[PDB]
Design a protein around this nucleic acid. Structure first.
Ligand SMILES: [Mg+2]
Ligand SMILES: [Mg+2]
Ligand SMILES: [Mg+2]
Ligand SMILES: [Mg+2]
Ligand SMILES: [Mg+2]
Ligand SMILES: [Mg+2]
Ligand SMILES: [Mg+2]
Ligand SMILES: [Mg+2]
Ligand SMILES: [Mg+2]
Ligand SMILES: [Mg+2]
Ligand SMILES: [Mg+2]
Ligand SMILES: [Mg+2]
Ligand SMILES: [Mg+2]
Ligand SMILES: [Mg+2]
Ligand SMILES: [Mg+2]
Ligand SMILES: [Mg+2]
Ligand SMILES: [Mg+2]
Ligand SMILES: [Mg+2]
Ligand SMILES: [Mg+2]
Ligand SMILES: [Mg+2]
Ligand SMILES: [Mg+2]
Ligand SMILES: [Mg+2]
Ligand SMILES: [Mg+2]
Ligand SMILES: [Mg+2]
Ligand SMILES: [Mg+2]
Ligand SMILES: [Mg+2]
Ligand SMILES: [Mg+2]
Ligand SMILES: [Mg+2]
Ligand SMILES: [Mg+2]
Ligand SMILES: [Mg+2]
Ligand SMILES: [Mg+2]
Ligand SMILES: [Mg+2]
Lengths: 186, 50, 95, 119
RNA sequence: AGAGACCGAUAGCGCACAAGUAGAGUGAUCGAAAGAUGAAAAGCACUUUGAAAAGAGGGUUAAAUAGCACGUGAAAUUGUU
RNA sequence: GCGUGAGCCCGGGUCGAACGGCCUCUAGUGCAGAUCUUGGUGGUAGUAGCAAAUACUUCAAUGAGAACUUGAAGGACCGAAG
């Protein structure tokens, strides 16, 4: 439909999205923010191992009064968790994106998570029975997910701005000094 | 000419379970032969005693 | 497979509860396509469905205690909880 | 560099069976009464996993009989079992081996060392 | 039946819609919310990934930055850069 | 860009069928408050919490996926004012 970046040409990249997914928004956002700019194979191995409970995803923004663990120190944070259900949903989109890359004919050896996004979704209605005959809402927070995969070049070792810089509007007294120094030095 | 992708998948279901069970049975037979050969072979019996 | 219907039908045919019906696990696929009691009586007559026996409950200790009571063994002062009138009323002794 | 050579030797030696004596009294000391029997099975599973490095253990219903024979609160102090390692033939398998444990019947488990069963 | 220096979907009758309807109360009675794709459905053939829902291609149209959650799509609040 | 000010005018993007300047007439004509009315949305917060009624376990089958689906084998409860 319309992705959030629009600076990526469709013919040199791959893309995928999914909407109305019934997964926790705050946990999925932390998983997505954890996997950003990584290699595709490394991200797939890391995220599946999260399901296997060998490493933990750091909780950074939505981490109010949450327990601590020793596996987060490698991220420099003391709070981390294991969102299995969001990891399971993420595998579906990462595999779908790989299927689109191979179908399009790109080289699957070296991919990068170029763009990734999690958005909120319309909520769902449920009720609760509290006390004294009162009723309170019982909501859910679904989300949309989308991502774009591109190639990796990372090779820039040249620029011409310094050579471009030139001196156009010069005063007469300074120009005279420049000429005199040119003569006295060469 | 199949009513699109869905029908092939519907039959593929049955085809897949049949082939997987059959493949497992074939592996079973292959190993069963390997084991018969291991049991019969006398080289191992002398090798362990030494 | 879902064999919920078969236990109810077998219990109805056998005239017992579903806690005493035994179906052998090794042809459950073939048992599942019964869907009728006439077929259930054919399966019970073929030995695939049987009725389990009752649980043991014997009165050996009770009757041997009765025999030991017949010769005055367990009727001391420490084994009675009611009054003598409750155990053997005077009204019936006089009667 | 010889790790692969040792696994190769193990390709011939993978089928094997031994006898073990599990002292369950020393591992069930202090646990809740309403959880002793379910915990003992998980301790047997971890004992087999540590013993054979298979990460896939299958219990014998006869061993279930021998561990649930005296209710939850009644668990034998010691038990004698047979551990045999065999290959997993199903193609869609994470790891290629698994263990199958079963109960060896004896009058008492005292005085017996561990031995490698030979056929 | 004919008209207006009247109102223009939180307005105008409670009702521009299967409105005195749905719903609450034993009962007398109380009583809502809800209009707009496009000139014409021409409402996405088929390929592929996927358990499915869905995605990517590829198609119709002047436009899908109009896709039956459909004209225009502001603020509170949220995501990436 | 203009005016002290309420405000007016232009450039760029989106969109698709009606709209302004000047002089008179007319009014349901200018909002931050009223524990204002209706609708929508936040921090608190991935927090409080999901703790009465004794209790579960092994193998096999179905299935993309099984503590709370099915079969068998154990262990238990209701204990005739059930
Ligand atoms: Mg805090
Ligand atoms: Mg605190
Ligand atoms: Mg707390
Ligand atoms: Mg409540
Ligand atoms: Mg009430
Ligand atoms: Mg909320
Ligand atoms: Mg009496
Ligand atoms: Mg008297
Ligand atoms: Mg203690
Ligand atoms: Mg109205
Ligand atoms: Mg409205
Ligand atoms: Mg109204
Ligand atoms: Mg509308
Ligand atoms: Mg499409
Ligand atoms: Mg479809
Ligand atoms: Mg347009
Ligand atoms: Mg439009
Ligand atoms: Mg909307
Ligand atoms: Mg719109
Ligand atoms: Mg805003
Ligand atoms: Mg129009
Ligand atoms: Mg007014
Ligand atoms: Mg206001
Ligand atoms: Mg005021
Ligand atoms: Mg309000
Ligand atoms: Mg809590
Ligand atoms: Mg509580
Ligand atoms: Mg309870
Ligand atoms: Mg299966
Ligand atoms: Mg339970
Ligand atoms: Mg009892
Ligand atoms: Mg009575």
């Amino acid at each position: 439909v319309r992705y959030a970046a629009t600076e990526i040409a469709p013919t040199k990249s791959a893309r995928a999205r999914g909407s109305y997914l019934r997964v926790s928004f705050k946990n999925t956002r932390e998983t997505a923010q954890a996997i950003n700019g990584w290699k595709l194979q490394r991200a797939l191995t890391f995220l599946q191992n999260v399901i296997d409970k060998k490493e933990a995803v750091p909780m950074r923004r939505y981490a109010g009064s949450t327990g601590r663990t020793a596996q987060g120190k490698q991220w420099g944070v003391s709070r981390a968790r294991w969102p299995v259900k969001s990891a399971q949903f993420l595998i579906g989109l990462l595999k779908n994106a790989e299927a689109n890359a191979d179908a399009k004919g790109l080289d699957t050896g070296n991919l990068i998570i170029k763009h990734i996004q999690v958005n909120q979704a319309p909520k769902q209605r449920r009720r609760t029975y509290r006390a004294h005959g009162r009723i309170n809402p019982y909501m859910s927070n679904p989300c949309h997910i989308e991502l774009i995969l591109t190639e990796a070049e990372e090779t820039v070792q040249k620029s011409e701005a310094v050579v471009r810089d030139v001196e156009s509007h010069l005063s007469s007294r300074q120009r005279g000094v420049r000429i005199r120094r040119a003569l006295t030095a060469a | 000419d199949n009513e699109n992708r869905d029908q092939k998948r519907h039959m593929e279901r049955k085809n897949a379970n049949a082939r997987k069970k059959k493949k497992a049975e074939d592996n079973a037979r292959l190993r069963k032969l390997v084991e018969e050969a291991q049991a019969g072979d006398e080289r191992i019996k002398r090798f362990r005693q030494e | 497979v879902n064999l919920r219907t078969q236990k109810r039908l077998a219990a109805s045919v056998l005239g017992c509860g579903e806690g005493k019906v035994w179906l052998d696990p090794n042809e459950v696929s073939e048992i599942s396509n019964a869907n009728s009691r006439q077929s259930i009586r054919k399966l019970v007559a073929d030995g695939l469905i049987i009725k389990k026996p009752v649980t043991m409950h014997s009165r050996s200790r009770a009757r041997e205690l009765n025999l030991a009571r017949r010769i005055g063994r367990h009727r001391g002062f420490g084994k009675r909880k009611g009054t003598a009138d409750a155990r053997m009323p005077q009204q019936v002794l006089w009667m | 560099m010889s790790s692969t050579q040792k696994k190769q030797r193990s390709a011939i030696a993978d089928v094997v069976a031994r006898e073990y004596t599990i002292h369950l009294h020393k591992r069930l000391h202090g646990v809740t009464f309403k959880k002793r029997a379910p915990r003992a099975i998980k301790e047997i599973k971890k004992f087999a996993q540590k013993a054979m490095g298979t990460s896939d253990v299958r219990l014998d219903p006869q061993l279930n009989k021998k561990v649930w024979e005296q209710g939850i609160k009644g668990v034998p102090f010691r038990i004698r079992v047979r551990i045999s390692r065999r290959r997993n033939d199903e193609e869609g398998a994470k790891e290629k081996l698994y263990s199958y444990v079963q109960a060896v019947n004896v009058k008492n488990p005292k005085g017996l060392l561990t031995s490698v069963v030979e056929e």
